[PDB]
Amino acid sequence: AFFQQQQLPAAMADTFLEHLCLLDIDSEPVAARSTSIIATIGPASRSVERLKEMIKAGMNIARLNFSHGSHEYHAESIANVREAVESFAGSPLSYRPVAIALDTKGPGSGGLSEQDVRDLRFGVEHGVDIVFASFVRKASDVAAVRAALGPEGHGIKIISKIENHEGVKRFDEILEVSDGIMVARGDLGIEIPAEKVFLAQKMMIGRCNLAGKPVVCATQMLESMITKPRPTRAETSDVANAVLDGADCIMLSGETAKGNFPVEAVKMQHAIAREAEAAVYHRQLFEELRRAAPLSRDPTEVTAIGAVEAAFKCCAAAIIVLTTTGRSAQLLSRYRPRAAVIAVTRSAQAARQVHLCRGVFPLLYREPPEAIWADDVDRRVQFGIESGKLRGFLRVGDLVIVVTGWRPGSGYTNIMRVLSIS
Amino acid sequence: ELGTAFFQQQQLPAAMADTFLEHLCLLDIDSEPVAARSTSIIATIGPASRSVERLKEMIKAGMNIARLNFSHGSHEYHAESIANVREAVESFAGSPLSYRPVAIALDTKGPGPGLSEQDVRDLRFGVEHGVDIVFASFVRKASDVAAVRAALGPEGHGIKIISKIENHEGVKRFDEILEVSDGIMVARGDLGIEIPAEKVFLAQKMMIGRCNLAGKPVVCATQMLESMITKPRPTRAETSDVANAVLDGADCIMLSGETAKGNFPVEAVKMQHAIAREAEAAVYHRQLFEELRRAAPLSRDPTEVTAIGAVEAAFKCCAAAIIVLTTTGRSAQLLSRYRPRAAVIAVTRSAQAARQVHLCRGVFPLLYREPPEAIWADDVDRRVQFGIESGKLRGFLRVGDLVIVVTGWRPGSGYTNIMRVLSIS
Amino acid sequence: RADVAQLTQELGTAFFQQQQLPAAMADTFLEHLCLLDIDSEPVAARSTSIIATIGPASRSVERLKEMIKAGMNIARLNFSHGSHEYHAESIANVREAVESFAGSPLSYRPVAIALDTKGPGSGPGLSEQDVRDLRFGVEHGVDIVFASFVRKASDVAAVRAALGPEGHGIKIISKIENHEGVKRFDEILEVSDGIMVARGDLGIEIPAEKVFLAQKMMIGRCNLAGKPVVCATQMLESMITKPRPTRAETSDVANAVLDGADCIMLSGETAKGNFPVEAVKMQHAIAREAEAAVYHRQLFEELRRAAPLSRDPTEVTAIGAVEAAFKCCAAAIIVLTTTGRSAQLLSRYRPRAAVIAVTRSAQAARQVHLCRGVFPLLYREPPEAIWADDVDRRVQFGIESGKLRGFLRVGDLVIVVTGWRPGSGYTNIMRVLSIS
Amino acid sequence: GTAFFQQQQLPAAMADTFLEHLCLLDIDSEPVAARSTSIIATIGPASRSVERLKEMIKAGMNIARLNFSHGSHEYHAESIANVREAVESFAGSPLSYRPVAIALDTKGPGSGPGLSEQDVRDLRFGVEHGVDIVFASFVRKASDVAAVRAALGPEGHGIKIISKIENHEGVKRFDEILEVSDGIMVARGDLGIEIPAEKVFLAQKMMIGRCNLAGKPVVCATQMLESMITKPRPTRAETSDVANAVLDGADCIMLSGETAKGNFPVEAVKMQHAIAREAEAAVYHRQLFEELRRAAPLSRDPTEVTAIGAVEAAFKCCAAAIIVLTTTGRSAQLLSRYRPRAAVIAVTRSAQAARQVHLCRGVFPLLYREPPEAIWADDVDRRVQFGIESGKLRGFLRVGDLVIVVTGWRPGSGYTNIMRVLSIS
Numbered sequence A: 001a002f003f004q005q006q007q008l009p010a011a012m013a014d015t016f017l018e019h020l021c022l023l024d025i026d027s028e029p030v031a032a033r034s035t036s037i038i039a040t041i042g043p044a045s046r047s048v049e050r051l052k053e054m055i056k057a058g059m060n061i062a063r064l065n066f067s068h069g070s071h072e073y074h075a076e077s078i079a080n081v082r083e084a085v086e087s088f089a090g091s092p093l094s095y096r097p098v099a100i101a102l103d104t105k106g107p108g109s110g111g112l113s114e115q116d117v118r119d120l121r122f123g124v125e126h127g128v129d130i131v132f133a134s135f136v137r138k139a140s141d142v143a144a145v146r147a148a149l150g151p152e153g154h155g156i157k158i159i160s161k162i163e164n165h166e167g168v169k170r171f172d173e174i175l176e177v178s179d180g181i182m183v184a185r186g187d188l189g190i191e192i193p194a195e196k197v198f199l200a201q202k203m204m205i206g207r208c209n210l211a212g213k214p215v216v217c218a219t220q221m222l223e224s225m226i227t228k229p230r231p232t233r234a235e236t237s238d239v240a241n242a243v244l245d246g247a248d249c250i251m252l253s254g255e256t257a258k259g260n261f262p263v264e265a266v267k268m269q270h271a272i273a274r275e276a277e278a279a280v281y282h283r284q285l286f287e288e289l290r291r292a293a294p295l296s297r298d299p300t301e302v303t304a305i306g307a308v309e310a311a312f313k314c315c316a317a318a319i320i321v322l323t324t325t326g327r328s329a330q331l332l333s334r335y336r337p338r339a340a341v342i343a344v345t346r347s348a349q350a351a352r353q354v355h356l357c358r359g360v361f362p363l364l365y366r367e368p369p370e371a372i373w374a375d376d377v378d379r380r381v382q383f384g385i386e387s388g389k390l391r392g393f394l395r396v397g398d399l400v401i402v403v404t405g406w407r408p409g410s411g412y413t414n415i416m417r418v419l420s421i422s
Numbered sequence B: 001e002l003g004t005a006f007f008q009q010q011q012l013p014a015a016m017a018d019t020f021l022e023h024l025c026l027l028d029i030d031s032e033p034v035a036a037r038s039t040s041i042i043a044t045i046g047p048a049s050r051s052v053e054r055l056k057e058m059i060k061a062g063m064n065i066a067r068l069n070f071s072h073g074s075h076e077y078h079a080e081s082i083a084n085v086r087e088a089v090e091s092f093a094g095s096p097l098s099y100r101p102v103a104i105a106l107d108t109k110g111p112g113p114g115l116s117e118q119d120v121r122d123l124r125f126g127v128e129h130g131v132d133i134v135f136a137s138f139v140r141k142a143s144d145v146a147a148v149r150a151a152l153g154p155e156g157h158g159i160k161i162i163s164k165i166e167n168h169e170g171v172k173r174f175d176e177i178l179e180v181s182d183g184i185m186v187a188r189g190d191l192g193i194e195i196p197a198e199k200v201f202l203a204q205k206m207m208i209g210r211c212n213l214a215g216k217p218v219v220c221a222t223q224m225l226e227s228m229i230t231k232p233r234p235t236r237a238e239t240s241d242v243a244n245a246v247l248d249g250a251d252c253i254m255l256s257g258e259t260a261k262g263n264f265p266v267e268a269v270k271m272q273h274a275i276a277r278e279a280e281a282a283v284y285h286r287q288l289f290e291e292l293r294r295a296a297p298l299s300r301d302p303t304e305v306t307a308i309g310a311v312e313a314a315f316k317c318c319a320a321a322i323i324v325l326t327t328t329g330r331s332a333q334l335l336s337r338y339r340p341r342a343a344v345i346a347v348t349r350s351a352q353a354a355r356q357v358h359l360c361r362g363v364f365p366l367l368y369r370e371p372p373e374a375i376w377a378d379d380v381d382r383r384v385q386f387g388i389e390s391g392k393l394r395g396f397l398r399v400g401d402l403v404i405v406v407t408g409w410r411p412g413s414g415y416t417n418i419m420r421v422l423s424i425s
Numbered sequence C: 001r002a003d004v005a006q007l008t009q010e011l012g013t014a015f016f017q018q019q020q021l022p023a024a025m026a027d028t029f030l031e032h033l034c035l036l037d038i039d040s041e042p043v044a045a046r047s048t049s050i051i052a053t054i055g056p057a058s059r060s061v062e063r064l065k066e067m068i069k070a071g072m073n074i075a076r077l078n079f080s081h082g083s084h085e086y087h088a089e090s091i092a093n094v095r096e097a098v099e100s101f102a103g104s105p106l107s108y109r110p111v112a113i114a115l116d117t118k119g120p121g122s123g124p125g126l127s128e129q130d131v132r133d134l135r136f137g138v139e140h141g142v143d144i145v146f147a148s149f150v151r152k153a154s155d156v157a158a159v160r161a162a163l164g165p166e167g168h169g170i171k172i173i174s175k176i177e178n179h180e181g182v183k184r185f186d187e188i189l190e191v192s193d194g195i196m197v198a199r200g201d202l203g204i205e206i207p208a209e210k211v212f213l214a215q216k217m218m219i220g221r222c223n224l225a226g227k228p229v230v231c232a233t234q235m236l237e238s239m240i241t242k243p244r245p246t247r248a249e250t251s252d253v254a255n256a257v258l259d260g261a262d263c264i265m266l267s268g269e270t271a272k273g274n275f276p277v278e279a280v281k282m283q284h285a286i287a288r289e290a291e292a293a294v295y296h297r298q299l300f301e302e303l304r305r306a307a308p309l310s311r312d313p314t315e316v317t318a319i320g321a322v323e324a325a326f327k328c329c330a331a332a333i334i335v336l337t338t339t340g341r342s343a344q345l346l347s348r349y350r351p352r353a354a355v356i357a358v359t360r361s362a363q364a365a366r367q368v369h370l371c372r373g374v375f376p377l378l379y380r381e382p383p384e385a386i387w388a389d390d391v392d393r394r395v396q397f398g399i400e401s402g403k404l405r406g407f408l409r410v411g412d413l414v415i416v417v418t419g420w421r422p423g424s425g426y427t428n429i430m431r432v433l434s435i436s
Numbered sequence D: 001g002t003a004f005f006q007q008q009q010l011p012a013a014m015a016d017t018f019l020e021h022l023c024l025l026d027i028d029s030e031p032v033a034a035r036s037t038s039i040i041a042t043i044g045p046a047s048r049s050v051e052r053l054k055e056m057i058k059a060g061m062n063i064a065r066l067n068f069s070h071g072s073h074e075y076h077a078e079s080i081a082n083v084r085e086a087v088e089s090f091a092g093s094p095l096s097y098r099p100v101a102i103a104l105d106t107k108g109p110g111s112g113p114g115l116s117e118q119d120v121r122d123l124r125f126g127v128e129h130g131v132d133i134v135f136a137s138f139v140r141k142a143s144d145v146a147a148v149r150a151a152l153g154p155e156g157h158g159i160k161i162i163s164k165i166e167n168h169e170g171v172k173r174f175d176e177i178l179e180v181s182d183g184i185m186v187a188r189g190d191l192g193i194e195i196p197a198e199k200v201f202l203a204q205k206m207m208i209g210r211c212n213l214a215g216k217p218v219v220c221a222t223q224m225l226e227s228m229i230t231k232p233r234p235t236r237a238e239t240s241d242v243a244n245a246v247l248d249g250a251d252c253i254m255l256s257g258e259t260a261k262g263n264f265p266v267e268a269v270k271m272q273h274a275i276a277r278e279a280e281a282a283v284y285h286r287q288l289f290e291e292l293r294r295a296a297p298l299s300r301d302p303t304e305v306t307a308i309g310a311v312e313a314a315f316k317c318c319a320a321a322i323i324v325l326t327t328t329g330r331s332a333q334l335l336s337r338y339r340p341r342a343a344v345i346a347v348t349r350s351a352q353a354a355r356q357v358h359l360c361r362g363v364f365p366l367l368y369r370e371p372p373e374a375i376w377a378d379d380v381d382r383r384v385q386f387g388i389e390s391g392k393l394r395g396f397l398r399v400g401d402l403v404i405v406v407t408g409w410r411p412g413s414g415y416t417n418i419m420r421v422l423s424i425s
């Protein structure tokens, strides 16, 4: 029964052609949905009650579009998101962190615009987790956004939006200085011929996967759902293909900001992503990601590859990792394990930000501290196992891989352990 | 000999990559497609695309197959659509650079227990009006195909039957349906209502994979450019869907309401043409050929053996084309199954095989009508030179190019066994 | 270049010219062969063990000390010739030569003692002489038995029974010497600790032109099963009378290593020849060159693809540790082992990194020479009060011995493999450590 | 039939990994293909008798080596005459006649820097006596090959030069030496004294790999079956060395003292023959072909393009043979570089090309003696039929086998461009 579910017959195929031939509509997904959903907040999704339904449907990142609305309007959206998120904090073993992303207006006809400087300052003051920087054309555009965030916004992630020909041509220099990328297909499809956008999307997703940096696929994914309860055949195909391409995140714009079916649009992206994730050909994907990642002397990079390899060997249900900044979980995520990466962190911001990395399931640790560091570490590892059992990630008899470090503080991950559940 | 400019076009840097990940990383929006568009476009005929003048514009935009939807309209209405298609096609019979065969496909209303009474009458109409293909609605099992085949009566055995898979049973009984069909249509409209909408992509990719493995045509259909029914430009998801159907391995892509009733039928055909050319150059032939080769069983059929030899030879020299002589279209279909980058120029005397080979990706049919030569070897050489001269006129070939030529040792279908490497003079 | 550029700037271009590293990074086996370089010097310690047959030419304590220094890891006693009194004196001389180096625990070399049986002869089962010789082996504490003419699983069960209750820890290496042994290979391997491709009798029992097929098949199947395989007979035959071997002989040694043999053997070359020490040095020199010429990239991928999924934490930790070692060009994998099993599971994935096995068992230290790339360290210190501290002291002993022995340098990365509780069978931890 | 798939290591051939390929090797799986690695036997007191030379030709000797390090010109001229008399004693049956090449192995430069005066005299003797090949001793750089070529003069332009790599400089300057040579000999005797003995296998495997990549012949030589000089059976290391030279990719294997002076010259040839057939069936063609294919550059030469198409076609149908018509041996050499499992039966009118193609693995030369037919197409067909009849008589072919036929579009060298699938009747 186990080997009939989650496209396991297709997973064992010897060629990609055979893998396609073995895909089965009756093979049900079992793993948790790995690709994060970004939902744009607007009139259709602003109320606290509506936001609670969207969190339950699978929204992981709330996008604030600073192209429209005042600072007062966006501050109320942030407060409503935080109120809806915290209404589930009463059960810490099931609570879902939700990131807040600020999408800038852009340069317009101009460097960094004066409105963007003000909006970025607003973001730092209101504690946003991510910035989606509009119309990034070169590395100096990213440096200007980084400078406008100041010393208090040092921890905010910058996702550069590639929306034009220059951004595509200067992609490598932009990615090098960014935390990740957004394939902003709306403007990109107007700036370059519409029939070429898929080449830019697939190239950028491939290069981000190679670099181990988050990549977002965005715009018109479920467009018809703005007025209709069900999407078109092209729309479900687009969502599935963005996941199969290797996108870490998928996005909804008008579908959630102004449409008549915001909750249904989130549920549809969730349903398709789970199906597409099981249809991934991990055998080739892992081998290629492994070969293309360079040799390293960083113990976190060395432990990550060892843990992902160990997970595939035993069909591990999860890789539990302790992380302060989210970096150890991100280095596991870059090899696209089938095993869920359960990230146990004390940082509420890192818990929100790791939604950018595919397959990272954040658990915010709020249990009392232990006097002995080693005892505290073990307690955090047991917390990950207990949340995993409660949420259905783990069952008795499963094997898990546990990733920890040799001393407190970030940057010291160097240990991988094989543990049998219960 | 070819130059660095040649190796920058048609995604050739991405083509030479050693991994699929590296292939994706090397895709270039500035690398322009050079080869002719190889995925055929099927356009549904209706009020928005019925006039002879509108049909001429759709033929120029790239329509290769005209679909008649027998779910609506009378026999008199469909006979007029067929006459208008044939008139528009024959208006270019004077200019060799623009004349192209256009297939006529009858899409049945559907079943009720066995084959419906209306389907028996419509299939008989199809034979009487000389349709090339039947898109059989709601095929659920092999006996449904046998019933459609029996309705093609005594005179319609040459008509191709493309089974439409529109429900759960059709997906589960896929292997037995494909075995007795000429090809398959992934009919996503009904399929997306019969099975959960989030599962349609799995059924599409599985069926395309299985058809590619079997070497049989597969059509991707429904809502590909849906928003173009009322808008002049499609959504980002729609262009992505067309590109991904081509990258999945679909031989044909289809337009329904977009060309039957929408406000932009010609623009919808142009958009599918533009995306297909881009997606075809982005195919990773290196792995696709290796996998088609490894999965395909050993063969002692000389046509199959010649086809793989010719496709291998074409990749070795970057051949501009493979010219094949075919009576039924079978030799061209066996070349097409290995997905060569080189265009497969099929020279045939059969007007029906010329229209029907549009079902096979990369097959460019040429209808030959010169009177037979007394010496068979001379008649063969005249047809080979006809394909070279048409290729030179249409942009496929130039003097100095290498072409692969596929022929047989004696007249009649079934004797293909020769592959020659020719330098264009 | 992008996959090695940063590590090349850090370790230097000189590092990446040695140990056939340009050939190691090749994308095809054809390109790997094209990049093999006679100027690319081996750096790693020799990982294929050398078995030397003891006889008149290699029996003295002084001669045995020179053979231990040349690289002999396993001493073979051929019970086809010589009395029990003769073999007991050979064992005592081996032990005296081995223990003459025990003064420095950080450099001491354990040497296994293997008893090679006379065989069944014309009989169907275990001969009466074999029953007596196997009982002699148990009484004299031999580590391994090379069982002659194994033809089926019941032959190994009979050898196991003759060893009795006291010889349960002795390893049984079944010698495949005839057609039936080749045909019944799978059932023989299943119940044996390992295999010996006994080419002398095999080359008489089957056509001489087919022996290479049997050798390559058996080595492949043992590599797949993760069990030791020995290549034996006439490897350096001409060295019995000549100081240098033939071109076919050096080729045969190199090819046995490239095939995947864990051990290579010398018979007459060391037992009766005029150059026993030079024969050991020649096998050592060739094995070092051939080990660096292994195409690890495909070998590791294929061992992974062919090996079934495992739910054993020692097995899962072993593959994780070998993967981690390849990622950082680790100088060594240090493993704590009671029976040698954790080191054997690391060894089955053929890491380029040396597997330094720290054990308290003197017998396990001798027996792990059967597994390619396992370097045994005998830990003589009594247990610490706190188990976690005792574990750390053994790891530090491995690091300090590794530094003094040239395996490790300051700045190197090492992979450390340990377990969660005392006793055999609980290995489940892998750590990445930087040498200070 | 199931019996077919149990022989010639076919279960191991179908394996998905090299590890699984090794695990499936079977000592009971008998070789079926003809032995494709050529045997070079050194001539001397033990192999000069015309009657003994006849036995060595029947045992499998393809190339007779004359070692000019020992013996006078008068002695070597007698060797040549005895070889030619033994070879020509079988010319009365053209369907079974086996050409045998004559190779002159030079004494070398000794302590000098360039071509020695004795080598200039021996090379002129070789041209005057019509030798086919020169094994040039101690080649250290490209200018050494140019000096050998100059000493052969205008009359020796057709002689093949095989450079012997015997020292450190020859290994370091390998690429420049191979570029100007026809092939290479891994001369292990001197190489094993010039460089550490434990490094010779690295040089042998590297040189064989580079020659396979270049598509140029490579010979493995010295002490392969050394103990057979005095003993009737070789050592386990000797049979292993022969098998491993074949598995490495050597086109030729050599016997020196074993045939020149030993007591078992005929048995030594039979032993190399027996091991080579076993080792050739144990080759993992699946990976070897893919790697030779990927490493070979794109080509616009029709002979090169036809060769890869024909090898691919041969694997698809399990062709028993590829019959090629060749004037210089080049078309057969280009087929040979892709290491087909199918025997390459080369039909030629050039007696010298027939002898020289033994340097290329898997090329079985047939000397056609009939004068040209009036109609060129008939002359081509007669040669193809001669290839089929010889192949049937020798056991290469049976009725029902598929064969790939490689020919050209016009007479003369350099025009191969046709590949034909033919059923043996």
Ligand SMILES: O=S(=O)(c1ccc(CN2c3cc(O)c(O)cc3-c3cc(O)c(O)cc3S2(=O)=O)cc1)c1ccc(O)c(O)c1
Binding pocket: A016, A017, A020, A206, A209, A241, A244, A245, A246, A279, A280, A281, A282, A284, A285, A288, A289, B020, B021, B024, B209, B212, B247, B248, B249, B283, B284, B287, B288, B291, B292
């Ligand atoms: O285009 S192919 O060469 C091809 C496609 C996909 C894969 C395996 N894959 C893979 C490997 C990578 O390293 C990577 O970065 C992305 C993806 C990738 C990308 C996709 O767009 C997709 O639809 C599926 C995959 S995958 O299954 O995860 C391998 C090969 C191909 C396509 C169709 C065929 O029938 C065929 O034989 C081969």
Ligand SMILES: O=S(=O)(c1ccc(CN2c3cc(O)c(O)cc3-c3cc(O)c(O)cc3S2(=O)=O)cc1)c1ccc(O)c(O)c1
Binding pocket: C029, C030, C033, C220, C223, C258, C259, C260, C294, C295, C298, C299, C302, C303, D018, D019, D022, D209, D212, D244, D247, D248, D249, D282, D283, D284, D285, D287, D288, D291, D292
């Ligand atoms: O060393 S390996 O990587 C290896 C060895 C051989 C091959 C396939 N092969 C191959 C491919 C080439 O392109 C080439 O030029 C030579 C040969 C080659 C060379 C040999 O020395 C040999 O004994 C066998 C082969 S082969 O089977 O034809 C592929 C891989 C290897 C060796 C042993 C293993 O158990 C294993 O899993 C992998």
Ligand SMILES: O=P(O)(O)OC[C@H]1O[C@](O)(COP(=O)(O)O)[C@@H](O)[C@@H]1O
Binding pocket: A322, A323, A324, A325, A326, A327, A328, A329, A403, A404, A405, A406, A407, A408, A409, A410, A411, A412, A413
């Ligand atoms: O992923 P990051 O940011 O590097 O954090 C990993 C760190 O977490 C730990 O496992 C636990 O550290 P803390 O006790 O400080 O939370 C460290 O040992 C390790 O260095």
Ligand SMILES: O=P(O)(O)OC[C@H]1O[C@](O)(COP(=O)(O)O)[C@@H](O)[C@@H]1O
Binding pocket: B325, B326, B327, B328, B329, B330, B331, B332, B380, B406, B407, B408, B409, B410, B411, B412, B413, B414, B415, B416
């Ligand atoms: O693809 P098909 O239908 O088998 O037709 C291929 C046939 O065409 C030819 O090349 C030419 O035949 P005709 O001269 O009869 O057209 C045959 O030799 C070959 O058998």
Ligand SMILES: O=P(O)(O)OC[C@H]1O[C@](O)(COP(=O)(O)O)[C@@H](O)[C@@H]1O
Binding pocket: C336, C337, C338, C339, C340, C341, C342, C343, C417, C418, C419, C420, C421, C422, C423, C424, C425, C426, C427
């Ligand atoms: O390789 P083996 O025989 O399984 O031994 C590995 C064992 O060694 C240890 O690392 C140390 O155990 P001890 O304290 O008994 O020496 C265990 O944790 C582990 O189970």
Ligand SMILES: O=P(O)(O)OC[C@H]1O[C@](O)(COP(=O)(O)O)[C@@H](O)[C@@H]1O
Binding pocket: D325, D326, D327, D328, D329, D330, D331, D332, D379, D406, D407, D408, D409, D410, D411, D412, D413, D414, D415, D416
């Ligand atoms: O291998 P080579 O030397 O290029 O010879 C191949 C030549 O042999 C042929 O098949 C037959 O030519 P001939 O009739 O002159 O012998 C030519 O068509 C072809 O060019």
Ligand SMILES: O=C([O-])C(=O)[O-]
Binding pocket: A134, A161, A163, A183, A184, A185, A186, A187, A188, A218, A219
């Ligand atoms: O801003 C965006 O998201 C776009 O243009 O697609």
Ligand SMILES: O=C([O-])C(=O)[O-]
Binding pocket: B137, B164, B166, B186, B187, B188, B189, B190, B191, B221, B222
């Ligand atoms: O009939 C069709 O084409 C469908 O249902 O998609």
Ligand SMILES: O=C([O-])C(=O)[O-]
Binding pocket: C148, C175, C177, C197, C198, C199, C200, C201, C202, C232, C233
């Ligand atoms: O017994 C042996 O060692 C042999 O036969 O090789």
Ligand SMILES: O=C([O-])C(=O)[O-]
Binding pocket: D164, D166, D186, D187, D188, D189, D190, D191, D221, D222
């Ligand atoms: O000359 C040779 O053949 C050698 O030196 O090996």
Ligand SMILES: [K+]
Binding pocket: A065, A066, A067, A103, A104, A105, A106, A134
């Ligand atoms: K914005």
Ligand SMILES: [K+]
Binding pocket: B069, B070, B071, B107, B108, B109, B110, B137
């Ligand atoms: K219909």
Ligand SMILES: [K+]
Binding pocket: C078, C079, C080, C116, C117, C118, C119, C148
């Ligand atoms: K014995």
Ligand SMILES: [K+]
Binding pocket: D067, D068, D069, D105, D106, D107, D108, D137
């Ligand atoms: K000589």
Ligand SMILES: [Mg+2]
Binding pocket: A134, A163, A184, A186, A187
């Ligand atoms: Mg935009």
Ligand SMILES: [Mg+2]
Binding pocket: B137, B166, B187, B189, B190
């Ligand atoms: Mg329908």
